[PDB]
Design a protein around this ligand. Sequence first.
Ligand SMILES: [Mg+2]
Ligand SMILES: [Mg+2]
Ligand SMILES: [Mg+2]
Ligand SMILES: [Mg+2]
Ligand SMILES: [Mg+2]
Ligand SMILES: [Mg+2]
Ligand SMILES: [Mg+2]
Ligand SMILES: [Mg+2]
Ligand SMILES: [Mg+2]
Ligand SMILES: [Mg+2]
Ligand SMILES: [Mg+2]
Ligand SMILES: [Mg+2]
Ligand SMILES: [Mg+2]
Ligand SMILES: [Mg+2]
Ligand SMILES: [Mg+2]
Ligand SMILES: [Mg+2]
Ligand SMILES: [Mg+2]
Ligand SMILES: [Mg+2]
Ligand SMILES: [Mg+2]
Ligand SMILES: [Mg+2]
Ligand SMILES: [Mg+2]
Ligand SMILES: [Mg+2]
Ligand SMILES: [Mg+2]
Ligand SMILES: [Mg+2]
Ligand SMILES: [Mg+2]
Ligand SMILES: [Mg+2]
Ligand SMILES: [Mg+2]
Ligand SMILES: [Mg+2]
Ligand SMILES: [Mg+2]
Ligand SMILES: [Mg+2]
Ligand SMILES: [Mg+2]
Ligand SMILES: [Mg+2]
Ligand SMILES: [Mg+2]
Ligand SMILES: [Mg+2]
Ligand SMILES: [Mg+2]
Ligand SMILES: [Zn+2]
Lengths: 104, 149, 48, 159, 204
Amino acid sequence: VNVPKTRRTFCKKCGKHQPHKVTQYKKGKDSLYAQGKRRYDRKQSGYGGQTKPIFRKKAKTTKKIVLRLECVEPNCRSKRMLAIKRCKHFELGGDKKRKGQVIQ
Amino acid sequence: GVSPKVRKVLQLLRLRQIFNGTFVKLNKASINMLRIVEPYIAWGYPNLKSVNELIYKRGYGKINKKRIALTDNALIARSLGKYGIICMEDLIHEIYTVGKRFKEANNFLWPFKLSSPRGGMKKKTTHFVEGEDAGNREDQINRLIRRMN
Amino acid sequence: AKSKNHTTHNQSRKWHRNGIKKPRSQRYESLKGVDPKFLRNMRFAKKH
Amino acid sequence: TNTKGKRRGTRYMFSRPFRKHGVVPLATYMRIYKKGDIVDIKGMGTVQKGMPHKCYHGKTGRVYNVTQHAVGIVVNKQVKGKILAKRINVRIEHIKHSKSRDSFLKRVKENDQKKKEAKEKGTWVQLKRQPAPPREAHFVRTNGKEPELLEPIPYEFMA
Amino acid sequence: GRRPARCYRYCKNKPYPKSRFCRGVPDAKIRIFDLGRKKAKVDEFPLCGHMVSDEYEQLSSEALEAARICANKYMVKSCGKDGFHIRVRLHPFHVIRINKMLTGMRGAFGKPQGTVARVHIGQVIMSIRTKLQNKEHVVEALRRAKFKFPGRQKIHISKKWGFTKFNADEFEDMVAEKRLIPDGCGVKYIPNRGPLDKWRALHS
RNA sequence: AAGACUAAUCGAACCAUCUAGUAGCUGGUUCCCUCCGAAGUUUCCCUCAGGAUAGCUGGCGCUCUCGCACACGCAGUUUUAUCCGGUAAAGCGAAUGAUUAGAGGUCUUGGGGCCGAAACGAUCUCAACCUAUUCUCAAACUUUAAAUGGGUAAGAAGCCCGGCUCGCUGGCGUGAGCCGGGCGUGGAAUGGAGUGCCUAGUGGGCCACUUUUGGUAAGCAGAACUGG
RNA sequence: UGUGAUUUCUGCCCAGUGCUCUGAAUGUCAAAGUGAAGAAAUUCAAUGAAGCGCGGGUAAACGGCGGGAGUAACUAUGAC
RNA sequence: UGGGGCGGUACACCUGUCAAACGGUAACGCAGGUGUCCUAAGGCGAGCUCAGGGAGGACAGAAACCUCCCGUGGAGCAGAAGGGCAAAAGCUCGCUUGAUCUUGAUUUUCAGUACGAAUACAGACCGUGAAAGCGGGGCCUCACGAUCCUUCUGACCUUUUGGGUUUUAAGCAGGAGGUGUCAGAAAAGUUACCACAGGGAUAACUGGCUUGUGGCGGCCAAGCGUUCAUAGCGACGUCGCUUUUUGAUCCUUCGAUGUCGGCUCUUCCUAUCAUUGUGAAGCAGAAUUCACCAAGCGUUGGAUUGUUCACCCACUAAUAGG
RNA sequence: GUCUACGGCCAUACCACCCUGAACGCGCCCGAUCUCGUCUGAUCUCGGAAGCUAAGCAGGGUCGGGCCUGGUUAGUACUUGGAUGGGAGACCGCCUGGGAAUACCGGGUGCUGUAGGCUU
Ligand SMILES: [Mg+2]
Ligand SMILES: [Mg+2]
Ligand SMILES: [Mg+2]
Ligand SMILES: [Mg+2]
Ligand SMILES: [Mg+2]
Ligand SMILES: [Mg+2]
Ligand SMILES: [Mg+2]
Ligand SMILES: [Mg+2]
Ligand SMILES: [Mg+2]
Ligand SMILES: [Mg+2]
Ligand SMILES: [Mg+2]
Ligand SMILES: [Mg+2]
Ligand SMILES: [Mg+2]
Ligand SMILES: [Mg+2]
Ligand SMILES: [Mg+2]
Ligand SMILES: [Mg+2]
Ligand SMILES: [Mg+2]
Ligand SMILES: [Mg+2]
Ligand SMILES: [Mg+2]
Ligand SMILES: [Mg+2]
Ligand SMILES: [Mg+2]
Ligand SMILES: [Mg+2]
Ligand SMILES: [Mg+2]
Ligand SMILES: [Mg+2]
Ligand SMILES: [Mg+2]
Ligand SMILES: [Mg+2]
Ligand SMILES: [Mg+2]
Ligand SMILES: [Mg+2]
Ligand SMILES: [Mg+2]
Ligand SMILES: [Mg+2]
Ligand SMILES: [Mg+2]
Ligand SMILES: [Mg+2]
Ligand SMILES: [Mg+2]
Ligand SMILES: [Mg+2]
Ligand SMILES: [Mg+2]
Ligand SMILES: [Zn+2]
């Protein structure tokens, strides 16, 4: 789809509409010292094999898009996470869908 | 082998058993009901002698939710004299001439328990135009009462 | 091994055997679901 | 096996009748719906917002709430023996007052009057409906003419 | 390839005609529904004799064609090549399905082999139009035809005039008075309601 | 070399113990009388020979009231008013779709061709085609439109009079709520109502009238209504 | 490990799969080790074995070893 | 799962019909669709008219472009179908980002639980409009996913254990990473060397209901027969019987009814191959063909093949069927 | 008798073609400085008042097309409940109750609420 790089939406700090900048959300590392992996290590350590399941049978071919907003106003610098329906193709700030013209 | 709609209408008329009988007054409300349970009954337009023979011989009262015989007028008056009815004849007047106080006189009476027809019936599964017993047999109901009683 | 798949045969007998009872109505019904802005004034009127 | 859509089996119900498509005649809107009123329901499919479910098309109910554009209604529903009461919010153009009580209202007012006036008289006159009774012994005239005489007709293989 | 007709005689299933939902059916074996001098005016051939049905059943396109031909042959040999006009008053719109067992009873929904026509009681199947000296030949023709159908049919003369819908005793007076006009193989009734310019054109 | 032999035992010997191994599956389950008295259906489960959930059943009660000169409330019911529906039938000279035949149109494209240089000079016609009529059709078409059916209402929780409070709405006013008074039979025919806990067995179905789907049919397969 | 006296013979295919040779000159490639930042846990970087890939040899190693059309002075065939 | 396997998905969802005029209602029943697409195809305001048909105009033609008239929707509105829409919900222009932040109530499937989808209100911040007002995604009906774990956002937010400071970790509230067997296990084959608990709730023989197919037979009569509808045949059509063919079904039988064919032996049927008594021919005689009463007595020897069926030789009154 | 502004019910009010329209109105009509928008004062906006019923509108006419409503079609078709009724079956008749639609033949062709003008 297409989305522009800016808009004006609600900042839950300033209590108003203010303009934002936009960028796509990615996912971070795992940090290796969370209580989840610490357990999974103390358990997977030794003899016995594999202890917790594994996932193999997939169906989906898409992902729900997630955006990341940032108030341009300095001394606010608040951020949010916003969501969209699913799509196979995505794009930030492309063309403008010209009407009336010829296609070559 | 009877239907729910029909099982209802009979037990309003207090006919919960074979060869029982009750009087009833006539209007648009009642007559349509009788068309609904037509094949299971047999009704008619009676005279005075039949009212006598029913009430004296086979005619009992409902008292304290019990069934008690009409042997004396104390019973009638004590339960029913606030309407100006103190004896047998006052009923019969109230019944034969459908009066103002009909509902109470009839509901005082228990439904009559009769015996099977001496002589026989033609065919109970049909109407009284095709050689049967069902439906309306207007004046000939009295001929039958002579043989049930 | 095949079987039956749907039936509503006997059910009306089951339903009426205990009855079909309409709900029990009361006066002074409940004020659950009405407009907030109207409900509010009722309080203030009764508060004075 | 059937599906579960919200408009399955409504080709004709949520369909406007013949030569009555178009804009809405707007005495529908200008009516007054106060609390306690008895109301019947009929889904107009010309406008899709706030319309009720199939199960309430043709049912009658009673008001409990009033909004800017809609009404709250209490409706009964028979579902597997037990009956339930239900509170559906519905917009105006799917409703209509019901004449199913105006007859009662004409009576009680006429009946209050007819009691109070003609009370000084002393008689307790009839006040309450009675069914259709039997039909009044009377005469019939043959103003001269003998009646007609009918009989059946022979069959014919007309077609 | 074709079955007997006891398998498909009764009006059991609902109509399943030829449309955008049912595709893949052949045509019918009958295609012509009237014969003889089919141009004659209303006055030449005033007599009509019909075949009438007495059952609620189904008749096949083959039956109709066979009956059509037997009647034509005798009727030619009797009267002439142009002494009559014959018309068939049924059409095969309903379709027949066949399940061929070369699984068993799984996936049972047939293939459109056939066409057939439905009949009600009192309907008409065949009709002939001719002159009055040839009455008995008309009866003889149809009698040969009933042996091609599965049922009990019967024959009767009509009081009408030809293939019209007006009684003979009235027709002849009623054409000499400008209510009925002979526009072809039929007539055209006209009432006293339109605009008078059509009353001016007539009566002149 | 045959999966053959290893103490009458071998596609993993025998002896004791773990060991009363586990079993949604088969077979069995010990005296009497009285009383009430069923289901084989919904949704979910690596569920289809099984469980949970609701329904059907029983027992234990409790709040009330009446022929106690004394009343309300209910109902596989009728009546009077009043709404809902698009099935049977009917219709196609009314829409969508299909289809037959001839009369007034070379409408008009062209002719195995047509009397001819051929043309719309004629004259036909055909795949279709203008006008008025005509024969036959619809589970997935319809202007029209039933019978049986479903929902409300039939009064004291009603009607009327007067006055108070309100950040709600506002030409002035409406609306809702609180207070204090005056007025009892409100169509038929029937009978005692209500409410709360614990709770088993079931969860394989079968037939008949009528309507009805697939199939040539079935003592065949799958459904709606009531009764067995 | 395969075939099965003698006689007379043992044809082509290293694409697939296995086996096998070398190899610092190239990606990838663990622990420990080396160094920089941090208040310290810690993080980062460079490094870099066998193996897998890159490349050769092998079928008395598992094994595998094609279709259409025209054509000869009667026709049919069909060397071409 | 009309025995199982191969096939298909009727395993989560949408439209119409079947469905018997409220609602609800089944089968590997009919016809079709889905796992998407959109910075506008969302939202406000203004202005206008669609499909086609006719008549005209330089090149211009069946069709480029201009103009007039008729035009109740016969066009379009992302996709399947259905409903609905004309100074719109369609086409075109101007401005924008209600596709935002936050509680609770109701409806739909339903146990009257959850997901999802939807509706009417209230508080904020806003956009468009002269204003009434409209808008918190797509005109409506479908387009999607729990605990446990991980990652990101937020508050000068609580805890980190005898007290204090800094880092890390754990917590609270909201999104995402996914389970299509779609109320949600982490998962390949073969057994003729095989085994156990059960099953006629389920198959491979007989029997039973049906008779499509197979066999046998009638009706009417266009033609054949040089001539001549009917000596003998008989199209196109149509009414039936039989269970010595193969199917459909799955009622009895799974704690056991011994599964092909030949050898042997008895009885029964008739839909008559011959023999007895007769009728009819396109019956001169001799041979042959149709039919009637009739089941009394007969219907063989051998090469081939496991054969039932087939086929040839040889004799015979005859070498018929069950 | 009738018009103007705003409307409710939305064809007894629509479609085609012909006749008449006193007074008040309603419109046609004359221009483009400024307001406003157009490729083009044609539409839209503004400023006007010489002339006109031709048109629009109003009423009226058509053995008018359609629409509204009666009758006939017809106690027909169909239908609740019933029977040890018929029949080889398909289907038919009867008892008790309810009850349609086409063709065809007649009639009608806008009702009105609020505010204000003309009809001296
Ligand atoms: Mg280790
Ligand atoms: Mg005796
Ligand atoms: Mg007897
Ligand atoms: Mg009976
Ligand atoms: Mg079951
Ligand atoms: Mg329907
Ligand atoms: Mg069928
Ligand atoms: Mg072996
Ligand atoms: Mg034990
Ligand atoms: Mg068992
Ligand atoms: Mg089990
Ligand atoms: Mg029909
Ligand atoms: Mg239980
Ligand atoms: Mg070797
Ligand atoms: Mg070799
Ligand atoms: Mg190799
Ligand atoms: Mg299975
Ligand atoms: Mg129904
Ligand atoms: Mg607009
Ligand atoms: Mg839109
Ligand atoms: Mg808001
Ligand atoms: Mg510590
Ligand atoms: Mg500390
Ligand atoms: Mg083997
Ligand atoms: Mg056969
Ligand atoms: Mg079997
Ligand atoms: Mg069985
Ligand atoms: Mg079965
Ligand atoms: Mg044995
Ligand atoms: Mg034995
Ligand atoms: Mg014989
Ligand atoms: Mg001008
Ligand atoms: Mg004028
Ligand atoms: Mg004029
Ligand atoms: Mg007219
Ligand atoms: Zn901010």
